[PDB]
Ligand binder design. Structure first.
Ligand SMILES: Nc1ncnc2c1ncn2[C@@H]1O[C@H](CO)[C@@H](O)[C@H]1O
Ligand SMILES: [Mg+2]
Length: 329
């Protein structure tokens, strides 16, 4: 039986999604797995999207201020995990920020900053503590979500790709695959080892102010997600000012922070995504404080002066490719 390398890529969930596999299984088995990966990505686009009218999430948001809504266990568990990171991060990551994000999403489309009072009003409808998850304990009992605050809206944009990367890894494993690189719009999961000999996957992290083509550094990892938050992934400009996609929930404006990017290395991409978002909002010192709560996670920060700091679990695995950057040790 020979090793073969495969990849497949499609535009889906608003972005380029690519999966690379090494396997000695029959090629028909790998093809079947990849078929299911990309079918899943189409199906979940219709469950999780905050910017479509027909999604399960859109339906949930339509019942804000009303009765509990039944959801499948997958969505329920994702919402539980999101609320866990909201609480741990003091709301720096907030999955109920839709009232504010939607004002900014139209701003992006129109290259215009939302209004002062409107934004102030929207912030009154973002209390994630008013998202009530309840699930009975008896056989077959439903899972429910209630949005208690009138006009509050869930937005899982910061974590949807991480969730889908974890679902993809679980699907690959279900198909007896153990070597893959999952890349959903830049949210990475490195499953197992690649082949050259078996070697770690070398995950690239971009120059925050670069074109994105080439990585500024790489980190060698196994069985790890790598998710990076940076202003650069999505912004608009108006009258000399850049407004990026990661909102500070205290201000209702794009976060003003002391790092250019934060990359989180975690066993679960869902977790890495939530934590990367929180850490970008919190800034470096408070991020270090939060991350001490999660010993199984590593982090790499790129500062505006091109210094790079990485935690102990990964620092020896970092290789700088763009010599303008310096890895502090
Ligand atoms: N502080 C935040 N916490 C959670 N999600 C956010 C936050 N700011 C923006 N978002 C959402 O996550 C996306 C950025 O990853 C945004 O497009 C928006 O949907
Ligand atoms: Mg700040």
């Amino acid at each position: 039986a020979r090793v073969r390398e495969y990849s497949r890529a499609e535009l889906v969930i608003g972005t380029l999604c690519r999966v690379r596999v090494y396997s000695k299984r029959p090629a028909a088995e790998v093809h079947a797995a990849l078929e299911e990966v990309f079918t899943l990505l189409q199906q979940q686009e219709m469950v999780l999207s905050a910017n479509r009218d027909d999604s399960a999430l859109a339906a949930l948001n339509a019942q804000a201020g009303s009765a509990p809504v039944v959801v499948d266990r997958s969505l329920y568990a994702l919402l539980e995990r999101a609320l866990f990171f909201a609480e741990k991060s003091g709301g720096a990551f907030n999955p109920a920020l839709g009232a504010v994000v939607k004002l900014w999403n139209i701003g992006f489309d129109r290259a215009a900053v939302p209004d002062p009072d409107a934004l102030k009003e929207a912030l009154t409808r973002c209390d994630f503590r008013q998202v009530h998850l309840r699930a009975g304990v008896s056989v077959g009992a439903p899972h429910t979500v209630q949005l208690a605050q009138a006009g509050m809206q869930l937005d899982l944009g910061a974590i949807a790709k991480g969730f889908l990367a974890d679902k993809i890894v679980q699907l690959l494993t279900a198909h007896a695959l153990d070597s893959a690189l999952v890349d959903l719009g830049g949210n990475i999961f490195a499953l197992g080892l690649k082949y050259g000999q078996r070697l770690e996957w070398n995950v690239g992290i971009r120059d925050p102010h670069g074109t994105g083509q080439k990585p500024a550094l790489v980190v060698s990892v196994r069985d790890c997600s790598v998710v990076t938050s940076g202003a650069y992934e999505r912004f608009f400009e108006r009258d000399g000012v850049r407004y990026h996609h990661i909102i500070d929930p205290v201000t209702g404006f794009p976060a003003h922070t002391d790092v250019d990017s934060v990359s989180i290395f975690a066993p679960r991409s869902t977790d890495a995504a939530a934590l990367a978002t929180a850490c970008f909002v919190l800034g470096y010192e408070k991020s270090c404080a939060l991350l001490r709560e999660f010993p199984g996670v590593d982090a790499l920060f790129i500062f505006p002066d091109k210094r790079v700091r990485a935690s102990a679990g990964i620092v020896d695995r970092v290789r700088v490719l763009d010599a303008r950057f310096v890895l502090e040790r």
